[PDB]
Amino acid sequence: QIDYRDVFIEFLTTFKGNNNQNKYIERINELVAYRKKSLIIEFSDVLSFNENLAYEIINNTKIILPILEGALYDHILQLDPTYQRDIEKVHVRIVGIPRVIELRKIRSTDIGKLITIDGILVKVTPVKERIYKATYKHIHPDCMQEFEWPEDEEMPEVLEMPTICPKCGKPGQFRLIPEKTKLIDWQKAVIQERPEEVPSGQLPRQLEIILEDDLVDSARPGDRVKVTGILDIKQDSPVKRGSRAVFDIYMKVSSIEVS
Amino acid sequence: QIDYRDVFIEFLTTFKGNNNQNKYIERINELVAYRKKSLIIEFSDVLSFNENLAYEIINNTKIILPILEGALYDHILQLDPTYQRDIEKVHVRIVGIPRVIELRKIRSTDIGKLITIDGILVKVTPVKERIYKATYKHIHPDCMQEFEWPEDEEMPEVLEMPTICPKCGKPGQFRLIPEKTKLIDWQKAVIQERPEEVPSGQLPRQLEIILEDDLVDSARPGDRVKVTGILDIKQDSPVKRGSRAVFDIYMKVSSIEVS
Amino acid sequence: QIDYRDVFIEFLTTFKGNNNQNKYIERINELVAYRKKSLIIEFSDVLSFNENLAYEIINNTKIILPILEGALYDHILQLDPTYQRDIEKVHVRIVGIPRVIELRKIRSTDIGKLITIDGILVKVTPVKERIYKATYKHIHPDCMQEFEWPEDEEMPEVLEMPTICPKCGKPGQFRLIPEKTKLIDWQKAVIQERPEEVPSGQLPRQLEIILEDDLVDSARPGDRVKVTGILDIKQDSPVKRGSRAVFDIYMKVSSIEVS
Amino acid sequence: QIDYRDVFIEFLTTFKGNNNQNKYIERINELVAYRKKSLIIEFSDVLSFNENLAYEIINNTKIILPILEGALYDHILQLDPTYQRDIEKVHVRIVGIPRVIELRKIRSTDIGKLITIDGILVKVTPVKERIYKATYKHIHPDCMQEFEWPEDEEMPEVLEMPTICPKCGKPGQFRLIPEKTKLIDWQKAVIQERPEEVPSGQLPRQLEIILEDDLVDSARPGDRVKVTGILDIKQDSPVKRGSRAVFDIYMKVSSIEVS
Amino acid sequence: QIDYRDVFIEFLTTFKGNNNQNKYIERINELVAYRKKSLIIEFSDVLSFNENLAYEIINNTKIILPILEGALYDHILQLDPTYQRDIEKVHVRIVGIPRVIELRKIRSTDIGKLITIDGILVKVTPVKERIYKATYKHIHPDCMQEFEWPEDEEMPEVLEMPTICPKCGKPGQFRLIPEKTKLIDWQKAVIQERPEEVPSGQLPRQLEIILEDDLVDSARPGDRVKVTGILDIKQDSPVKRGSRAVFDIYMKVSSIEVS
Amino acid sequence: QIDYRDVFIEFLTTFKGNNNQNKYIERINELVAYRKKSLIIEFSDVLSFNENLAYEIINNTKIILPILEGALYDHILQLDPTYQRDIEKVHVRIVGIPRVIELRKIRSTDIGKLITIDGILVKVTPVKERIYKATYKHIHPDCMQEFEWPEDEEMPEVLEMPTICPKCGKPGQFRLIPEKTKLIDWQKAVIQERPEEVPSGQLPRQLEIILEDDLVDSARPGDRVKVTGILDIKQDSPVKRGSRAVFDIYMKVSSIEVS
Ligand SMILES: [Zn+2]
Ligand SMILES: [Zn+2]
Ligand SMILES: [Zn+2]
Ligand SMILES: [Zn+2]
Ligand SMILES: [Zn+2]
Ligand SMILES: [Zn+2]
Q: Is ATP-binding found in the keyword set (chains A, B, C, D, E, F)?
């Protein structure tokens, strides 16, 4: 009904700020100049410029975010096509949202909303790679062809491969082709309740968080962090019956500020 | 034959109490004002006002409780429709029943009855989420559709997924869609015999209990608690032959009073 | 050929005892009055009244015992039908048999006979529940019906579920319905050779024993016990090939006297 | 061609011995009187009475031994049919054979011959039970019948169950019926090189041995034993490809003398 | 469009160097004389002689390198056909590239490019062998033929064997024939951040590197090394669903200089 | 083209040696007299008498060795037919070849050649047995027959069993029949770099070697040995995809000289 791309682009270009300057235009400039790949937009700024947009961001997130990103990417190549063939996705990273929840108080009604948590980062894995699109090769004498996997969809956390080959239509052996697989940087990090928040006698609760892409290694153990992201439930052996039915919560991280 | 809703509603509205006041009317007021989502009704009060109702509560529980909850919900929206779109279920939490069983004395004739156990809470997990309705997506080129799973029925503790797709009627791969899955807050807690009750020379017995929704984190290790709920047998690998046949008992907790 | 029910019933009603009283009639009275669910009959008494019956008891046990139990149940309901709908099986617990075997001396020819072992109880699990009759639900759009499982037969220690559904005849997913499942109280305990019986230099041998129903918690670690029951071999992953073929012995306990 | 039963029976009845007495007649008498279930025959005695027989024993063993046993059993029931319904197999246990091999020196050419080893017993398991004939029950609505398993053959160490039901001829679920399964007492024991035989600098080699039936618990850790039996190769996960191909040697024990 | 073989060959033959000598011609001479099997070419030299080629090397690597290698092999056999039947592939090892990345700074956009890392070798496995071409035998009464496996393609790190036999066309058991298998020398080593580069408080990150063929054993633990090669993701149980989707990075090493 | 048997036989009979004696004729005499079953021929002697033969031995080994063994066996039975029915194969064990490789220097160009390694034996397993021909029995009511397995071929290190029964041609369950299985004596031994050869600062490398038949227990931990044999790659889980592709090297030992 109403194009949020336009409003977003207008927002970045028009929004004044504190000293009648052009925050965001300036920010995007620093972004192109350094081939960094994320734009940090301050929430209160959006709401101020437009509440319809602010609303979407908090409540729609999953869809709108990629729309806004797609728009930003376009805007950038329009300023510097050289950015292409270096960076291919951009990331709109929302910060400073009113939605601050103490870690202990997270409940069911918070899954799927964009929220913020304040804690101490106590653990981070080394940087690893997640597949977001695979290439398989159908090992079968009559096919032997390659194809991108989850077609028009991203690979789920769990990793799946086709039953039936979409090039020949027959079942069989499929081999992953890593050199043709698209990867995204990935890091698991554990955050815990700040000491001040821990009811006496009790041990601090933790929350697994996932940092991807340029978010990776953006803070270290001991740091105090505001992490902003969307909560979800995490899986290892799903689709298998056996038992479970009970899930841990983790945050897919959208933005992070340190100390 | 006899509408318990009416009697329950009448009960809440007519029952006087100790000071010729209207306990329950007052309670429900405090419930709306604070958007809390449980009503605590004292058992002895019910029995007093009506023994037919009391009986049902202890012996029918599984069905009747939701009847009473449905009635309560109705009564509340009738006072304040704003309660809608904040809370959608209410939980009627019964307290103070005459049915107090010493943990060590629990036997098979007790499974399925609403009972009460007094003990010391020695362990609590952090809060997790239990699926009570999933959405799967049939990964199959010919379908690729979504559906709520256990249809007209809640998900078992164990987690199952269909063999045959209710949308296309064919078998295959099913993927869980968490963003569309209904979740309820969940916590396992271990409760143990009160020292006064442990026969000398022997080790205290323990009992796993499950706290769901707003019961979650309502007490902490070291607290003395009266937990009221329904006993059941707990599973990890069921439907699987191999061995077992022997099950642990746990309490599905209905209400909890602290220290 | 010869009805043991009659003889048993006659035995309980006629057998005099030490003071020309009616032990057994008296015992059964105490049984009804207290809703206890086991009758203890002294072996030497039986043999005395009838050797044919005594013989069966020791050597036929597996079948005859339930005959005798069936008979006792009938007799009881004939005195007080109120016993129904409280207790539904009875338990004839035989005591003081001449067949006392040293734990270390048990051999294959002993499996399946009613025997007695004298030892020190060293471990007891808490009380769990065994399934003796399940209810499954055939998860299938076309059926979705319930049925009691092992039909006209008890559940084996191992837990099985049907291949083919006896309501619709087709195969598929079956889900256990605990609230409709029959349960029996269950306790594993370990018993070990009396120090007096352990040859010097060597470690005491042990024997797993199972206590069901009202035998549960009838003795504690450190107690000296005479357990009377039937030996059998114990299973965890059977029907599976792989290896095994070698089994542990355990006693299914019929009666127990402490210290 | 030549009936070894006759010769064996004649041997036991005729063989004089040292003081013109009837060793063996005497031995078998002590056997019936005590319901013991093994006859110890001295090798040198056999060879002396008949070398054709002696030869068979050492070289044919596997078959001839059961022939000799079958003959002995017959001979015994002929003296005392009461022995029936107590003992059903007997065991001819050969002792004092010329074939003494040092444990370290066992090689391929010794597998399948009856040999003797002298060592120190360093380990024995508790007594367990091996299945030598199973009873399965075909769990299938159309059959539901029982049958003895390996038909006209003993169960291999490994434990197998039928693919196709020999009562109905269809495949499916088969459940073991323990109460109807024939068992044999079983004990694994480890024997090692005597210190005097151990080349200096090197650690003692061991040999797993299996003791069945009345051989069980016939010696304890620390004992010096001459064990006489047939060597074989031992399996856990056989029939499965994967790897292995390399096997340990164990002795199926035929007789044992202590210290 | 433009033959890099010619340019490469021209490069090696024409490129002068520092003293108007013919570095490369000289290098290749030393290569033939000693039956060494790798030519080290200095990057800055290439760029200088031709930037189009330099570009390919850094950015195309995966394809171009084998082109260049093929070309070098031809050139060599043209000077000394005796080199055949000793060495069959050559290895063009590129050194001194401008693309030096800090180990901790590696990201997804780096996978697949030829890069250099500077670190401390902390671990090396012994030398093992990798299969690059297998020979299987189709164990089948009707075939029983041999064939080289991945046809016209190298063996993936993971090892696969055909579904369908390319000699008979039918499926079945395939057995590896090592004596007919092509092997390459292989060594896993771990490399870690230089102390100078490890931010205070934090633990050094590490990187798995693989050394093949004549690179094997070319450095030892404690050595400071500049490794140049291509990053890739590493696999152990891939093609299997279950979970993962998350991968470690390792470098497939093209050249290495010590301390 | 040229019969090596003749040359070998001539070699053994004509070759003089150091004192114009007949080394080898003498050796073979000592072989018959003691029913030992290996002949040790010194390499340099062969080369001296005939270089064509020497060449074959080093480079053809796999075939030629058994040719030479067959010839030797013939020659022996011709001197003493009594050697038959004691020994049925002879093993020609070559010693003192010029091909001595330092353990650390072993590379892929060495696999498949007969080589020599000098080292310290640090570990030996006890003696075990390797199948070189199995007998399976097709467990199937319609067959139930026995057959030698790998037909006209030795069992791979890995152990396989047929998919289709060569007796009836149908698939199913196969059971190994050890009493009818051919076995060869087997010992794994670990050999390590001589201290003099270990580069300072680094850890000694090791090499698994396999001793079969009469080589078994021919040396003990701490012995310095020259082992001569053929290198190969070793397997545990092969034919299985998953990963690997990387293999350890081991020596299949042909001869061993101690200290
Ligand atoms: Zn295909
Ligand atoms: Zn579908
Ligand atoms: Zn059904
Ligand atoms: Zn059947
Ligand atoms: Zn084929
Ligand atoms: Zn067959």
A: yes
Tell me, what CATH number does A170's domain have?
Answer: 2.20.28.10
If asked whether residues B92 and B211 sit together in one domain, one would say no
Residues E7 and E122 in one domain: no
Residue of chain F minimizing CA distance to E158: F243
Specify the pairing of strand E206-212 against strand E224-234: unpaired
Using DSSP, state whether B3 is helix, strand or coil: coil
Strands (E) located in chain E: 39-42, 92-95, 100-101, 114-124, 128-133, 135-139, 146-148, 173-176, 182-192, 206-212, 224-234, 246-258
Of E126, E157, E175, the CB nearest to F245: E157
Distance (Å, rounded) from C-alpha B155 to C-alpha A247? 14
Number of domains observed in the structure of chain D: 3
Q: What is residue F116's three-state secondary structure?
A: strand
Find the C167 Cα to ligand 3 centroid distance in Å.
5
Would you give the DSSP letter of residue A100? B
Q: Report residue F62: phi and psi, to 5°.
A: -40, -50
Among residues A228, A217, A229, A224, the alpha carbon closest in space to that of A258 is found at A224
Q: Is residue D69 domain-shared with residue D152, that is, in the same domain? A: no
- Method by which the model was determined: X-ray
Are residues D191 and D156 located together in one domain of the fold?
A: no
Rounded to whole angstroms, the Cα distance separating F187 from F215 reads 9
Rounded distance, CA F60 to CA F83, Å?
28
* Residue linked to tokens 């270290």: A220
**Residue D72 neighbours by CB under 8 Å, 6+ apart:** D8, D9, D12, D28, D39, D90, D92
Q: Is E200 exposed, middle or buried (0-12, 13-18, 19+ CB in 10 A)?
A: exposed
The reply to whether E85 and E109 lie within a common domain is: no
> Residue B258, Cβ neighbours under 10 Å: how many?
12
B135-139 sheet: strands from edge to edge:
B146-148, B135-139, B173-176
Nearest to A151 by CA among B144, E218, C86, D186: B144
Residues A230 and A172 in one domain: no
Identify the domain containing residue B146 by its residue range. Answer: 133-180
Both C16 and C82 in a single domain?
yes
Q: Is A68 helix (H, G, I), strand (E, B) or coil?
A: helix
Burial class for A259, CB neighbours closer than 10 Å (0-12, 13-18, 19+): exposed
Write out the two tokens for E205: 């990150």
Place of tokens 């899955």: B181
Within 8 A of E161 by CB-CB distance, chain F residues are 239, 241
| Last residue within a domain, chosen from B74, B99, B124 | B99
* Nearest in space to E234 (alpha carbons), one of E248, E214, E224: E248
CA distance C1 to chain B (A): 37
What is the domain-level CATH number for residue A121?
A: 2.40.50.140
Identify whether the C-beta of residue F148 lies closer than 8 Å to the C-beta of residue F138: no
CA–CA distance, A87 with A79 (Å, rounded to integer): 14
Q: How far is the CA of B64 from the centre of ligand 3 (A)?
A: 29
DSSP three-state, residue C104: helix
Taking the centre of ligand 5 as the mean of its atom positions, its distance from the CA of residue E164, in whole angstroms, is: 8
How many other CB atoms are found less than 10 A from the CB of residue B128?
A: 17
Candidate from F175, F235, F239 with C-beta closest to D239 = F175
B220 and A201 Cβ atoms separated by less than 8 Å = yes
Where a domain ends, among A161, A180, A199? Answer: A180
Q: What residues does the ion ligand 4 have nearby, CB within 5 Å?
A: D 138, 143, 165, 167-168
**Helices (H), ranges, chain A:** 4-14, 25-34, 43-49, 51-59, 65-77
Alpha-carbon distance of C2 to C6, in angstroms, equals: 9
F225 and F249 in a single domain? The answer is yes
| Contacts C236 to B, Cβ<8 Å | 242-243
